[PDB]
């Protein structure tokens, strides 16, 4: 049987479809991870400060405390791999696919996190 | 009270001579001698009857045949081979199994050895100082880019940082808890470890309660750190490993370093 | 709503680092648990699928969700049937299970993706196999065609015709179908149902089942006073299996820890059957339902229940130790993209032997022109027939040499 299948290619064939960087202002005096330009990234990135912190700890065994603005984080970590760090968040939890755009904003929605993008608005998953 | 550990394992790191199933890397020619000789030899000098040798799941008679044939030692080995190992963990799997048959203070040596140093003088030092653990370092080729980090301090001779440069951050990375007690540090860059180790009996109890140990290198000796808060309960002297500084040639085995050996050798 | 269970078994096979458990999951919904203690043992595919059909014609009828919202429907679908899949892997390697699988199938299913060579060995044993062991329906499928140009395919396809002349099997339906895009899957549903005839099930000559992967179905630090028995999850080759029933384990586990391998096959009995969502009394044979036997939660683990067989009290599958292997040599080595001649037996070699359901290591003991026995150190068996594929040590990693034949 070869009759009903080009038909179906056809279907098949036609259903088919940054500079957003902030500059980390960090002096390596270490010890402590200390971060306080992070309210300048939370901002311009459209993004609450916690998220942020929340990925770190994911990705290092760090222990700390939220400081209204600056940053108290266990551990001498440094500006190139902390920075190699954010640079990854930037490219798996900021993008998006349908459409990329510039902002994207992020709302609370019901306990993991579902980020909107200000342009159309659709909801894309936040955890990896 | 006094025990020695032999640990023997099969090549994988290596580019060529160990494929075959016949031929072990416990038994290998270098020129015209076993490699094993010299680690026997060393036993010999030190004077110890009870020695327990550890072996993979793979060659079980061949490193016995291989003990028995040729060689002096003229003592009583005693081999094993438990059947939990799977390569992907070294010797650390061996230990955490290994435990009532432990009676003091143990003496632990791989099989890829070269040695050329004083051997009693390690073993009485650690006898004397009264510490968990002790490490050797030996210097890089003189005669004609990053390898891995060392600290040193000296006044007693102790070890601080001993990290490896594998999955490396780019900037430096160490701890002002651990740098403001022990004012002064030397950084060593040229220093590498030989895979000599001693190791005394409060260290059985802590295996069983909680596994933490990797490659024998990573977290065997690392979890020393009494800083900060401390929250772990000792068993009952802080815990602090020791390292020792020597001059002549006695090197390790693992990357691109067995041509080289053999050059040592011939002159 | 009340819902039937499985009676027709569809089969998804094909080659190695293509895709087909993801296939599986796409086509019926839940993620399979196959690729410490829990979901891992052997490579196999498990997952309940839906035949709801509305009809108030072309494609599009089928959906994952018993509650339909996506077309334009508001009402509910109509009972048809119900589908438990099997997924077998498409390795050199690991072709016991595959043969397993077909004994068990009423639906094949092929697969092959436009990216490799068009002349195919594995494929092509596959297709012997299925001829062998009385089977007609087979269904062909096209795996990756989104980064295909145009005309490419259509080269594929002529080349696959080509291919497909002198062989038994001839009625077989081709549907181009995806894996990611969670799209044409109703198509590939609506095919089952029409080109395939209704199969006179049927319950005797003598039931069989293969355990493929081992379940210890618990919360983390169950009481004393509740305590349920070890789940294992197999798929049942031929005859209905009932509440009431002594089954045996049949390889033997090694007890001793010198070392004898001589000894008696574990007897269970089985207290409560897991399919689809709600419990069910009987068992209609043709998927992985999980059958939960009298068996300490320690035995089901992870590398000791590596495809053992469950029988009733007497019958044939049986305990092996070395193993009957009747092996037909190639010419040369294939795998390759340089090529050695096969060369013969040596004595005392460990090499990895695959019979049945099992992927296990094994010891050589005599050298024969035809004939091999060998001594297994971790569970092996066999059901009623069911061919050998062997795999031996030449550089690092496993290597095929050829298909076997086994003797009891």
């Known amino acids: 049987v070869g009759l009903p299948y080009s038909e179906l290619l056809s279907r098949f064939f036609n259903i088919l479809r940054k500079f957003r960087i902030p500059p980390p202002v960090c002096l390596r005096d270490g010890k402590k991870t200390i971060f306080s330009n992070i309210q300048d990234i939370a901002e311009k990135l459209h993004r609450s400060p916690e998220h942020l912190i929340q990925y770190l700890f994911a990705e290092l065994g760090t222990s700390g405390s939220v400081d209204g603005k600056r940053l108290v984080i266990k551990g001498k970590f440094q500006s190139k791999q902390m920075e190699n760090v954010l640079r990854r968040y930037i490219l798996e939890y900021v993008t998006c696919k349908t459409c990329k755009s510039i902002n994207t904003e992020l709302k609370r929605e019901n306990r993991l996190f579902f980020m909107v993008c200000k342009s159309c608005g659709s909801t894309r998953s936040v955890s990896s | ?267 | ?408």
């Open chain 2, 1 to 267: 009270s006094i025990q020695a550990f032999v640990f023997c394992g099969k090549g994988s790191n290596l580019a060529p001579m160990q494929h075959s199933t016949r031929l072990p890397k416990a038994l290998l020619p270098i020129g015209n001698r076993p490699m094993i000789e010299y680690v026997l030899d060393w036993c010999d000098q030190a004077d110890f009857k009870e020695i327990s040798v550890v072996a993979p799941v793979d060659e079980i008679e061949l490193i016995e045949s291989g003990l028995t044939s040729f060689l002096n030692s003229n003592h009583s080995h005693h081999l094993q081979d438990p059947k939990k190992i799977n390569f992907i963990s070294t010797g650390e799997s061996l230990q955490k199994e290994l435990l009532p048959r432990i009676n003091g203070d143990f003496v632990i040596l791989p099989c890829d050895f070269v040695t050329d140093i004083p051997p009693q003088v390690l073993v009485d030092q650690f006898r004397n100082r009264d510490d968990n653990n002790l490490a050797m370092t030996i210097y890089y080729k003189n005669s004609l880019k990053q390898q891995q980090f060392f600290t040193v301090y000296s006044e007693i001779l102790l070890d601080v940082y001993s990290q490896r440069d594998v999955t490396k951050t780019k900037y430096l990375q160490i701890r002002s808890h651990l740098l403001w007690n022990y004012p002064n540090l030397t950084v060593s860059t040229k220093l590498l470890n030989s895979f000599i180790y001693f190791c005394s009996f409060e260290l059985c109890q802590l295996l069983k309660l909680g596994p933490q140990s990797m490659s024998r290198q990573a977290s065997f000796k690392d979890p020393f750190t009494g800083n900060q808060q401390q929250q772990n309960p000792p068993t009952t002297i802080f815990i602090l490993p020791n390292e020792t500084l020597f001059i002549r040639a006695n090197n390790l085995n693992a990357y691109m370093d067995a041509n080289r050996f053999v050059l040592k050798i011939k002159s």
């Open chain 3, 1 to 408: 709503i009340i819902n039937r269970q499985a009676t027709i078994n569809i089969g998804t096979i094909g080659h190695v680092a293509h895709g087909k458990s993801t296939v599986v999951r796409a086509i019926s919904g839940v993620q399979t648990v196959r690729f410490l203690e829990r979901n891992i043992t052997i490579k196999l595919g498990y997952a309940n699928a839906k035949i709801y059909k509305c009809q108030e014609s072309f494609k599009s009828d089928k959906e994952i969700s018993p509650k339909c919202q996506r077309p334009g429907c508001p009402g509910r679908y109509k009972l048809v049937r119900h589908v438990s899949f099997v997924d077998c892997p498409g390795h050199d390697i690991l072709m016991s299970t595959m043969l397993s699988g077909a004994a068990v199938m009423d639906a094949a299913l092929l697969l092959i993706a436009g990216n490799e060579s068009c002349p195919q060995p594995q494929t092509s044993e596959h297709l012997a196999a299925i001829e062998i062991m009385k089977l007609k329906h087979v269904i062909i499928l096209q795996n990756k065609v989104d980064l295909m140009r145009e005309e490419s395919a259509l080269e594929h396809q002529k080349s696959i015709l080509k291919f497909i002349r002198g062989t038994i099997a001839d009625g077989a339906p081709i549907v181009p179908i995806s894996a990611q895009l969670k799209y044409n899957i109703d198509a590939v549903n609506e095919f089952i149902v029409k080109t395939i005839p209704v199969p006179p099930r049927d319950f005797m000559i003598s039931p069989r089942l293969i355990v493929i992967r081992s379940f210890d179905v618990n919360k983390p630090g169950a009481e004393i006073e509740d305590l349920k028995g070890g789940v294992a999850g197999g798929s049942i080759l031929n005859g209905v299996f009932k509440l009431g029933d002594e089954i045996e384990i049949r390889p033997g586990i090694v007890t001793k820890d010198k070392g004898k391998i001589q000894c008696k096959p574990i007897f269970s009995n089985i207290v409560s059957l897991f399919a689809e969502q709600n419990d069910l009394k009987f068992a209609v044979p043709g998927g992985l339902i999980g059958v939960g036997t009298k068996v300490d939660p320690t035995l089901c683990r992870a590398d000791r229940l590596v495809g053992q067989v469950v029988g009733a009290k007497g019958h044939l599958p049986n305990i092996y130790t070395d193993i009957e292997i009747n092996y037909f040599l190639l010419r040369r080595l294939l795998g390759v993209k340089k090529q050695a001649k096969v060369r013969k037996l040596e004595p005392n070699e460990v090499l990895m032997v695959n019979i049945g359901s099992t992927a296990t290591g094994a010891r050589v003991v005599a050298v024969k022109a035809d004939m091999a026995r060998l001594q297994l150190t971790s569970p092996a068996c066999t059901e009623i027939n069911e061919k050998i594929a062997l795999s031996r040590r030449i550089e690092k990693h496993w290597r095929l040499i050829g298909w076997a034949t086994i003797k009891k």
